[PDB]
Structures are given as C-alpha cells and as structure tokens.
Amino acid sequence: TKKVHIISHSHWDREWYMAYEQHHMRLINLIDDLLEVFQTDPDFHSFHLDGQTIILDDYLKVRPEREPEIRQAIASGKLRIGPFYILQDDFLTSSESNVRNMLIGKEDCDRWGASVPLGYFPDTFGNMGQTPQLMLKAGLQAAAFGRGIRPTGFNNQVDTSEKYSSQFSEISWQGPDNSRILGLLFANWYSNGNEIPTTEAEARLFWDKKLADAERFASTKHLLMMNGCDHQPVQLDVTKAIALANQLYPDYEFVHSCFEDYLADLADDLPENLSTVQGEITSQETDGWYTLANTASARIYLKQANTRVSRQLENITEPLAAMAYEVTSTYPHDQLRYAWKTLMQNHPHDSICGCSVDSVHREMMTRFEKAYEVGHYLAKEAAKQIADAIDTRDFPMDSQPFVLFNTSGHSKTSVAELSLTWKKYHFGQRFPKEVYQEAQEYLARLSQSFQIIDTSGQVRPEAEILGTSIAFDYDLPKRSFREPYFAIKVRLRLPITLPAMSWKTLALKLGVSLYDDSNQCLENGFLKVMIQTDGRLTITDKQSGLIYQDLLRFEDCGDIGNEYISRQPNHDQPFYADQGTIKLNIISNTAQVAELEIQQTFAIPISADKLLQAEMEAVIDITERQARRSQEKAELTLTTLIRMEKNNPRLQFTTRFDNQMTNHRLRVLFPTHLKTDHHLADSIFETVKRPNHPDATFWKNPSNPQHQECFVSLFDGENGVTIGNYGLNEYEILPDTNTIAITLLRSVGEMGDWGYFPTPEAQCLGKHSLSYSFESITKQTQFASYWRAQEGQVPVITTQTNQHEGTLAAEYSYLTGTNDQVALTAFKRRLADNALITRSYNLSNDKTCDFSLSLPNYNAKVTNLLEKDSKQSTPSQLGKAEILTLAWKKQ
Amino acid sequence: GLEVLFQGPAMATKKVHIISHSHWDREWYMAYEQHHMRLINLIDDLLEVFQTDPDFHSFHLDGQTIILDDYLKVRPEREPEIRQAIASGKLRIGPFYILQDDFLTSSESNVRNMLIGKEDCDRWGASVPLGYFPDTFGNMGQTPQLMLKAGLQAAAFGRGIRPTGFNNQVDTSEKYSSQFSEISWQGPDNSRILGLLFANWYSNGNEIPTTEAEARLFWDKKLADAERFASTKHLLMMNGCDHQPVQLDVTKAIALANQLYPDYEFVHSCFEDYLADLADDLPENLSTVQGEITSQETDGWYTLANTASARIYLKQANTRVSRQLENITEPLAAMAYEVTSTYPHDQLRYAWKTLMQNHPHDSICGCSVDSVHREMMTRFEKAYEVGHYLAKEAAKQIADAIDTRDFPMDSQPFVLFNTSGHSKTSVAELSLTWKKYHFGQRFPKEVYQEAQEYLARLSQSFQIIDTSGQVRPEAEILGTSIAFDYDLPKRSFREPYFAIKVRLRLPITLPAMSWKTLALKLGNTVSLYDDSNQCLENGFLKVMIQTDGRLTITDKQSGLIYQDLLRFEDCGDIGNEYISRQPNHDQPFYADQGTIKLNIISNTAQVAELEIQQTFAIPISADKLLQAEMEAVIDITERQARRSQEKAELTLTTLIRMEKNNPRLQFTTRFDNQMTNHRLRVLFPTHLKTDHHLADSIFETVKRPNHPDATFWKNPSNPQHQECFVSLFDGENGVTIGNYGLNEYEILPDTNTIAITLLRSVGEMGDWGYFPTPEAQCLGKHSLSYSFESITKQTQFASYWRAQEGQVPVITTQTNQHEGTLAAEYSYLTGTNDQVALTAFKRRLADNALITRSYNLSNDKTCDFSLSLPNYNAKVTNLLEKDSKQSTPSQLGKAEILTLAWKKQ
Ligand SMILES: [Zn+2]
Ligand SMILES: [Zn+2]
C-alpha cells in the first residue's frame, strides 16, 4: 500500500527563451490563478513556488494591492515558499553568492512567516560538492535535484564500480567535510506528475506508467509525483484528478501534498541501505554530451561582469564598511541588501549560464552595472570614513596624505597603479579657461620632483612617477552644493606590501630592468620567462629548476553548437596563433615591473558554413551536425600583455582582440607534462579534486569541459602549476600532455535546448579583454598560489584625506593569524546586531590545518551560514573542507 | 511702549517665504544608482530633522512622486515614517510622477505623468497644488489647458521669460518679457493659469547663512533680487539647488534673518501656503504670456533645443513604446473588455511607470552620461515587452469571440485591426501560419522533413477570402517557408512546432477603430515604377529619381513641382548633448555629390520599393583641437576646432516606398555611422511662399515663424521640436513631412527648406563640466523613418493625422472557425473628423468606463465634434478621468482637448 504524494508546482525560470517581462506577465497569470483556486476549491492543498522567494516580489511589483491575499495564502500553507531567493547555477556564481542566496531567501521567508525545509536544485547544471555542508549550516537537512546523477535500477546487484549510480531516488549525500544530507533525486524528472488526467481511460494509461516509473526507484512506500513543469500553468482540476486516481487504485493512497509533509513521511520510513554519493555531482558517469557544462564559456563577458560585482561587494565594499563602523557606528545594511538582490537577479541559472535569448543578456548587463554602482559608492564612502578618522598629523602641510587598503584575507604584495590629486583649482565664479591656464602655469613652473613619504618622513625610492596632467573633477559634499575643479593629477607606480585586512597611510610631496631585449627574457627572483620566436613562452622556475616550454598557445577551433554545449565540427583542426605573424612591443621596463606585448596575426574561418543555418532551423541535435567552418578566412589579431612584478611569483596576462568571426572558440593552453592523473579546481568553498581523464566506461564526448571559480592547478606531489583567471570559468585538462586549457571566447548563434532560438549576440562580436595568470609551485607554495589567484582579483584600494587629528592609527591590521591553507571569503557585519562576521574555509579536502584567525580585542563565537549563533566552541583547527563562520564581539 | 501713547504711521512689511527643496535629477552626470544612494541620504536627513527640529516646517520634494518609490525600494521599512511625514505636511509631494521634457515625450505621456502622480498622491494622502516645471527646456503651449483640466491652477517654471522691473516702461513688442515673477499664462484654447517664474532661479535661497556678517551680505542681495520682480509683498526664496542636501540649520538661518530685518517676516513655508497668500494679494491683472515658451527672445545659443537630436535612437525607442501603449495595447484591451469583462489596469500601470522612468528631462533629452542611456534602453525594452504581451492577448481575446463560421474548414481565419482614430489605408505586410507540424514525441528533423514534403507537393496557390468567399485579387503572395514556432497555452505546457508560413502583402482600407476578418486558403498590371524613366507614379504623385539621387516630385492634383528633394547633408558638430555647433567656416558635404546607385527592391501595381544609395567621403572626426577645448570646458560658442582632414566613405541607403492608394511617400534611411562629431540631415526645399510653419506639438499644431527673432537671436541655427510632423502651407498648397522619433527639424527660411535631423554625433555631455560621452557619438547601424506628402487646403488636416497614425501598423491575429458573440467586421466608433485627432482609447480604473481623448488639430478654427461609440453614452471628464458636470460639446473650440467617459446604454 503506497502513498502517492502529488506536489503541485511550476518550475519558473525567471527569464529564458523570452525576455523577463514576457515570462513576468505569465507569472501574474499563474499567481492570479492560484489565489482564485484557493477560494473556489477548498480541497486544493498547496502549491510549491519553485523554491525561490523572488517570485513573491515579482508578483507584488505588478499587483502591490494583493499583498494581504499573498500573506494569507502563505499563512495558511496554500503557497509554499523558498527557502532560496533564486535558483542559481552553483558553479558560475561565487562561493559567497551561494550563501547570500540563502541569507536573502531566509530573510524573505522570515518576513512572510513561512518556508519550505528543502534546498531546491531541480534543474541545476551540476551540483557543487559542498551542498551537504551548505545545507546543514543553513538549517536544511535535504536537497532535491534533477541533474548530475542517473538512477541505476533499484533492482541491480552491488558491484559498485559506478560511483555516481544510485539504486534509489533517495540518497545519502556526503560532502568533502563529511556532512551528510538527504538527496532527493527527481529520478523521473520534476514533470513526472504533470497534467494528471480527469477521465478514466486516460487516467489509467497515465497512472499505470507513472506508478511503475516511481516504484522503479523509490526506497519507501512514499512516491513523489511532481505536478508541474517549466512555466506550467496551475492544474486547476487537480482535485478531481486525485479523487479519480483514488477511485481507480484502491491499493494506492493519492494525496495532494507538499515537500514538508513528504520529507516528514520519508523520515519515518527511510531504510538504512541508501546509496552514498560523495562530493560533486556533475554527470561523471554519463556520455558527457548533455552536462551543459559549456554554459561556463557562453557569453564570457557576463561571467567577467559577475566576477567584478562579486569581488566589489564581497571583498571591497563589505570589508571596508565593516571596518568603517568603528568610526561611524553604522553599516549600510539596506543599501547592501539592495545591491545583493540586484546582483542575484542575474544569478538564476538561465541568466548567469548565458543560455537565454539576446534581450535577456542585455537586461543582465544593466543589472550588473546597477549593483556595481551601489557597491562602488558604498566602498568609496567607507574608505573615506576611515581615512578622515586617521591621525594624519605626522605628514607635513605641504603634502597630500593617502591611505592604501588591503581588503583581502592574506598579505598583498603588488605594484599599485595610482592617480593622485596633488592640487585642486576650483572654478569659483571664474571662466574655466582662466582656471585651466593657472593649472598649466603651475606645471610649467614646476622644478621639483614628486615623492612618496611615510609618517616618519622617509622617502620610498621604489615609487615611480609616470607623469602629471590636468583633469576636470568634482566633489559632492554631504552638506553643500557640487564643487567642480581642475585637478593636477600625479600618475605613479607604488610597490607595496600590505598585511591581510590592513591599511597604511603615506603622502605625496615635492622634493637593472626586469626585461632583457637582447635575450627577450623577463626575469625576477622567481621566474625566467623566455619569449620564443613564435610568441610562446619558455618559463624556468628558479627555485625548483623545472623548465616549461611552449606555454601560452592560442588555439582557435570551430563551434557549431549552442549556448549550452560546444561542438567542434567533424575533422576540425585548430588554428594556432603562433603559426601566424608575431610582433613584440615593450610597454614598460623597470626594476619593479615589466610589461611586454606579444601580438599574433593569424587567419581563421570568418564563420561556419551555410549548412549550420539549416541544421539550427531544423533543430538538429548538436551531436549529429555536419556543418563545418567556412572556407573564407579573415585575419584575427591577438595582443597579450604580460606583466611581471619584482616580488611577485605570479605572472599576469591580459589578452585582447576584436572578435569579428562567428561560431568559434578561442583558448589559451599551458602544457605542463606533469606526472599526475588528477587536478585541482577552485570550486564552491572547496579545492575539488578531479580526474584528468573522464570515465571511459560511460564518456563519449571527445571533450571534458569543467567549471572553475578563481583557479585550476596541476600538482605532482612536489611541483606544479597554478593558472588563475578573472571570470574565465571554463577549463579543460588535456590528459595526454597534462595541458591546462582556458577558454577565452566561445561564439555561437543560437540558445539551444527545445527549439530554434536565434541569438546573434551570443557570437560575442567586438572587443574583448581576458585576464589570467601563471604561477609555478612547490609543496611549500601550493596553497599560497591558491589564495593569490583568489585575492589577486582584488586591487589595493586607495583614498585621499588631509592633515587632521584622528582616533585611528595611520597603519593598522584589523586581523592577524593568517594561514596559507585557510581562505577568507567574508568580512562583513551581521544584520541583527552589527557584530563583525568572518567566513573562512579549508583550501584542502584531504588535510586538516591550524586555524589561527584573530581579531585584536575581539572574542569569536561560531555561527551557521545564516549568522545564527551555534553551541559549538571556536575550533583551533579546521576539518577537511570545513567552512567556518564566526561572529566577533569586543572583549 | 512709547508708541502706544504717541502712535506713528502703521508700516507695511514684506513676507519672505523660504521653501526648502532639492531639485533631484533622477539620473544625469552619474548613473542612476550613484544619484539614488545620495537620495537615500537626503530623505534620511529629512526624517531625522523632522524628529529633532520642531521649527522645520516642510520640504518640497521637487514635484515628483517617483522619489518616494526610489527611497522605499532601498528602505521599505521606512514606509510608516514616510507616510507620517506626508500626513503631517513635513514632506510636500507631487503632483507629477516625474519631471519631463515636455516636447520630447508624447502628448499622452504628458497626461499620464499627471495621472500616475495623482494616483501616487491619493495613495499617500497629500499633494501640492502646483504644476512643476522648474528646469524644463521649453514649455509646451498647452500647459495652461493641461494644468486646468488636471485640477491645477498654477505652474512654476524657470526658463524663457525675462522679467523687467516695476521701474521701466514695458516693451510691447517683447512677447516673452514680463513685468513680474507672476504672470497670466494663456494657452491656444484660451485657458489661463497663474505662471510662477523662478526669476532668480530655483536656487536663489540656497545655503542661507547662520552668521550675521554673511547673512547681511546674503539677504541685502537676495531681498533686492526678489523685490525687483515680485508683484506682491510675498517674496519667494527657494532654499535648494541641483541635488542639494537639506540645509539642516535653516531654522537658525530664518531666526537670524527675522532679527536682522524688522520690516520682513521670514517664514519657513511651502508652495500651498505661498499660493494661498498670492490669491489674497495678486493684482487683478498681470502681464499675459501667450502659448509656448521656448526662449524665442534670447540669443538662441542656450535654449538647449538640440537635445531633440541627441541620441536619436532613444527618441525612436520612446516613440515605439509610446505608440505600443497608447495606440495598440490600450485600444485593443479597451475593446477586449466587452468580451472578457476585465482590463489589465495593473500591468498597464507597471508598463507606464517603467516607460516614464525614461521621461525625466535629462533622461529623454539624451543629455546624461553613457551609463544612464544604456540603462534607459533596458527600460524601453521592458515597457515594450509588457505592452506587446498585453496587445497580443487583447487581439486574441477579441478574435476568439468573433463568429468565424462563414469561413470554410480548409481555410485559416485572421482578423485585421485598425487601432487608430481615422480610416487606415495601407498595404499590410503579413506572415501567416498556414499549418502546424507539432514535435510530439518524434525527432524534430523528421517533422521538419514532413513539412518540406508538404511544400514540395503543393500545386495550388494561396488566396485571401472574405466572409462571402470572395477572393481579394490585390493580395500578393511573396513566398512560403518553414519556421520553428511555439504556442504557450493558458492551461497546459508549451507547444513547439514547425509552421508553414505564408508571406504576403494585403492592400486594405479599414475604418477608424475597426476590425475585419478574412481567411487564407488554397485555390486555383502596370507597375508603379518605370525603370526606363526612373519614375515612381501613382494617382497622387509623380516621383522622378534624378541622376544625382535627389527627387523631383509632381503633385498630380495641383500640378505643383518640387525639384531637388531628399538631399542628405553632413556637417560638423563640435558641441555637446545640449547644443549643436557647426565649426567656423564649416562647409556641408552632400550625398548627391558622391557615388550614386539605384536598386529596385520590389515593383508591382500595389507597391514599389526603390533604394537610392549614395557613397560620399566625410571627415572621420573633429580635429585634434576639440579634445583640448572639451577638457578645458571652453564654451561651445568660443570653440575653434574644425573637422578632421582625414575622411572615410559613408554609404547611405534610402528605401522609398510608394503605395497605390497612398498620398504619403515613405522613406527609410540606413547607414553604419563610423564617424564622430558630425550631424546628418535630410532636406526638403519647398520654395513655398509663407512666413510661418506648423509643427506637431503637445496636443496642438503650433504655428511658429520661419525666421527667429532678429532683435535677439545670434545662433545661426534655429532648431525646433516636433512630435509626428512639421508642415509648410501657403493657404492653398503645402508640404507635410512626417517622422518616427526624429524630433528635431529646422526651417531654412530663404528657400523654406524643411530639414530633418537624422543623426547628431558628439563626445561630451556639456553643461557644468567635462563629462566625456563616447556613446553619444551614436556609432553603429541606424535606420530612420520619415515621409513626404504634398497637400492642398482639402487634404491638409488628413496629412496631419496620417503622419500621426501612420506610425501605427495594422494589427493582425489568427483564430480558428468558431461560434462567437462578435461580428466578423465591426467599427467600434463612428463620427470621425479630419480636424479632430484621437489620442487615447482606454479604460478607467474606477469603473472600467471607456475613456476617449480627442483634440482640435487647429489653433485657429473651431470644428464639428461628431465622435460616437455605438451602444455607449458619453459624459465629459477632466484629463484625470474624473466626471465633470459639463455637457458633451457638438463642436471643439480652438485647440480644445476633450476627454470623455463612455458607458454602455
Ligand atoms: Zn530551469
Ligand atoms: Zn533639472
């Protein structure tokens, strides 16, 4: 005797094959229909709103007058909401974003008065390894998902060579930290109970199939029927359907249910023989063609923009505002929430994955700009608040003080690129022309040289003055009208080391190079970098002695696929930039920094052939496509700026070009020839270990694209390579040579999936600039290479202030006790009480480590990810893959 | 004390009304969010001062209710506090939603601003009885009528009137001079309102000192400045400025002022109180200003009229969304209500609020930074999508209720709608779905093959029939194809299919606000263009394409001949987003002097499409000096920059479309702009003998001189604003040029040439600093649409509504064979008049009455008003849709705007 739980739902992709507003208007219809059916049908139990609270906001933005009816429907349990804000892509949103989704989701649920105790990942294109820890520490003990695993027959014997097979639709999901949750697999998809018939003959055919399908995998008598699908209207006659089903099947108890009741029933009946699945679930034991992993390189410009806003909020704005609270006794919670919600409107999977129509991705760019602007405003305000409260009296009156901040979790060594204001010539009531000329005359008369001093008056000899100029600028005072002026600007380079979460005040006053042109060699204490005749690099590690030849190869291939899936044409042969025309240009060359440009011009097919258009129009599966690249070629010019800094082991690259070719992919390759069968990728709160070969038992796709956050690394036990990136979230390991391949551009012409949706802007025509890095590592520098790749995305922050008394010291470290193996991801304050919150995680899944983090004259208390206090004592060590959130209060 | 037993004369006092405010441009020299965060600071400071200073009376929130929404979007928890501040009168709000540019927003948009503003004010429970135009770059001539019929009797404005003292003889030739800062503003319909001029700007009372020495200097100047122009003892001191923070110590400043000046009563005041005091003390008669205020009597350099051609792509987008909402979505939904008993009020409000977020003057004027205008494009898309969804739904609701049983089962019915206020004759360009091959559980490829085989085996021809089964022989089948498509049912899952699509043109005439049902089925002479002659000819016009690509057009009715029409002129522009400046000694480049080629696109008896293509070399940019002049904030009039020596080829392609029974010749000019700091115009030399011209303006065809005022004007150019058209008419014959979002024109008076601006490319914002705006160069592809019609006395007014309604295509939708309550052919209104424009056809929120709005296309003559909706009775309402007690007129007064509510009989 089975219990058949019918859960009515709609999987509501916020924006996808139509612009947001087209989906939005149909969402109004859905909720209108729900509110009406709650009135006309007393037996309609509930409706699951797809796990995302944003739906409620979207509805009320159009029908604000319906707020009381919405609140009532939630209060009665007829609308089952959240527990998330949006339904993300796990891998393409930042580690912090994965938590903020839950923080905002919970805030919304608390406001409405109800939640659903189920992490909801119905459609997610691969599931992060840390889902179990992320759920447990967000007050959730279960997650439901539809992708990444294929249920083996609940029928078959043990064997168990298949790591990602499951007997049942219920699993014990274990993460790298040993956290365990219930994994509820939609084994028959989230549409298995869609459109239940209300007439006998049709109902019989439907239920005989559906019951058998669910029983094939159920570990209990509780069968889950998901009554909904993508943008599915509510089934208005579902009560009639359920009543019929009960009449037709005396041995089955059909009930209109909800996820909370379903989990309750499961809890009572779950057996002890659930399959365990360990870590990330990314379709490892499939044919590899439909992982949709190539969303990582769809519209890379979106991922770059996301990275910029994420770093702004997490690593600049929040840390500065957290510290500024000392001065102001306030922290901008409302403005930050507004910025975070704006950013996360770009985090629904179809949005960030770049797998929607053109209109959707144009709208996303605007959202990125808005969230950035808010974060940028708040960061500048916080930095000023601190600087204006620093005791800057040690600097002479004929100097211009400025404060430099490292807002990251470890020591930051860099050559900071600065533009400081030396003098302001205000417009007043004069003609701007007169004021401009006065500034010109000051510079014409200037005979002294600009210098950088510390509080002791000591000159920093390593600073390099690059030039002076006049530039219009303005100030916006808090208590008076705008103030326009011409500024005398001083452009300079400043080598500096700043400890974690620290500031240093300096001031501007009046008072053998790295590159060898005869050798075409960039050299510092760490690396010797030989630019080859073909533009590729030979890099020698000066500590280990290891030599890497033919690094930095640019590779252009055909792509006849879509926004989800890359497909190289049959017989595709790459075009290599190094086989074209090579030119070298020195941009700068001092003892502190060298910048070299390597330029290649090579001919590539301008497009795909005409067959592609026919194959897309006919909705031909990507694996069957016969289209090739065009015969006609055009010259593509790549320019890569290589930046070496004196005391920096990390070599920085920026590759720029104007893309005027369609249906192709550009990658940069780093062949390592390292002896190892695995690699390490920056994933959501974990450095996840992955095989270099996909599983040859199941895998058919000639490629194995994988997701990364800030870096990917190969390491043989003593030596290795770490490649960092900025918003370049797709990599591949080429196992024959252990080459790291980073995707810089992927251009396609259609969305893909269920139909033909032309997306010409997915071709990514126009200018691009991609940044990435190389570091050669040893056992001793491995973990530092990982936080450098993460924290290297965040520049030294500067702000100017005058000479004044102050309550703050001119240099200060807000925290101490850094560990190479311990990443810092959050430094913020708590909404409830303004307590300082930190979040750290173990960069290893294999080893515990010391946890030394300390904020001077604060005590730490352990919280969960939602920043609610736990009973756990503060550890002195981190477990494998542990994510530790701490609230800090004055001693 | 001693004055009581030895009394002297009772002395008069002045009353100094200090109104604290902030003029809050929503977005401008920074992105919206940068201004938005500072707005949070302003309101935060305000709420704090209300709690700490009992003497702080009120703050004027810049006449725009959007500010409240913007604040609460960030601090939704402050709603109770905001409500209490409004209820107590400490925050003075609206009466508008936003502060628009008048001329660059649609006629209806100018009303919707007031409708939404009033709605917001009603929700909050307070308003301010003052139309608010503090900074508007030109004030529309209908402001007095628009205010009165939205229940407002006063408007405040800052630009375009020169107040003279009470010490000098008024000069009667100065139409835009005033004696005082208070005027009677009289509109073309004879409506009068109180005009409140910011004679000393809206910043005259900014940052009032709180220390005696400085306060003396301040007030000695400010009092004299205000008294100079005040008609009463009541002096207006505006305590604020652009993005000005609240003056937290204004109470102290007012207290000090009261101590220092015994003869002056300083009070922390508000506009409502100021207007009440004026009602008591205003003289019975004030200087009259008649009509539009556009800075006619100035040097013409700082009118900011060239905002009309800044980022023309914005104006085109705005026109598209405005037509979508006003003339497609609203009319369809209004009619669909008869079938469904529901109308999408909430969704329409959302669409309108979204669109009007692009209507603040700095937004729509194109005079902000690059980030702002990128954000605006997203808002236009959003508003359009909402309107487009609702129109499609409404058309389907109507079609599904039509009795389509007269059509045979082997045919595909479709309904054609004219959603405009007059008869619509056009050649509809259609793509109909003949058959659908659903995916089901098959591989799409197999379904695709089945559709292909169907088309391959097709032996019959497609035809269009009516309800009597009669074939329409004028219809032209252009082709058939297979296209992926999908349906989104109300009650089930998406339905993908391959559709057999039939592409065709259908000449059709549809009465005003009407539909007609036809069907597609299968069944069994002299072209308009003569290539030997290079001549397009119908019954109205003979159009000879000259060897140089300009046109010679002969009006076949009147015999008049116009040579050398359609000249494309490229000039330099070394100005900014506000002001166009041609360099010293600039010589135009003409496309007709380049390489000319001609291409026949289509040519039948019903339609001919010709492309004239010119390639001509123009300077790629301004010279190197312009950058230095921008960087040093050199005034545009003093700039010495010229165009670059280096040139590149610019290719223009203009598609000319002539239709058989259409007097209006349609033009679409396209090109890829890759040159900076230039202006492209199209010229129509008329040589018509007339000293005035007529432009489509806000609910009026405004009359303007062809020469600017030489007593004052120094600018060599005289750019003017237009909505849908501009016209020259000599009393018997004329020319009407229509446009689609090309809102800047100029009349060149020596030849009476109508010049339409197609592109203006500049590299900085302008105004108070150097704000580089590379995207204001408008690089990339452009497509501009406009029209020519030759008119007589008998066709003048029809040429005007054709230019307006010709922006709106015939609407179509398909439906199957079914019973229905609606007739297959129906006219929803009758009693059209060439002289009466229809601008609104919508429903009212309160009771779903059908609202119509019409206006008189003449400022000079009355006309009959015949509008009738069968099955309905009308009563007169104001612009805000509030019933009046006025009887329905049978005539329209000069420039009258008439709003009616219709209810079933
Ligand atoms: Zn989805
Ligand atoms: Zn303004």
Numbering used by the authors:
A (entry chain B): 3 to 513, 522 to 901
B (entry chain A): -9 to 514, 521 to 901
What text appears in the publication on this structure?
Streptococcus pyogenes M1 GAS SF370 ORF Spy1604 encodes a putative GH38 α-mannosidase. We have shown that The S. pyogenes ORF spy1604 encodes an α−1,3 mannosidase that is active on disaccharides, some aryl glycosides and can also effectively deglycosylate human N-glycans in vitro. This, coupled to the presence of a gene encoding an N-acetyl glucosaminidase (Spy1600) on the operon (an enzyme known to break β−linked N-acetylglucosaminides) would suggest a role, in vivo, in the utilization of human glycan-derived carbohydrates as a nutrient source. Comparison of SpGH38 with Drosophila Golgi α−mannosidase II suggests a conserved domain architecture and catalytic centre in which diversification in the “leaving group” subsites accounts for the subtly different specificity.
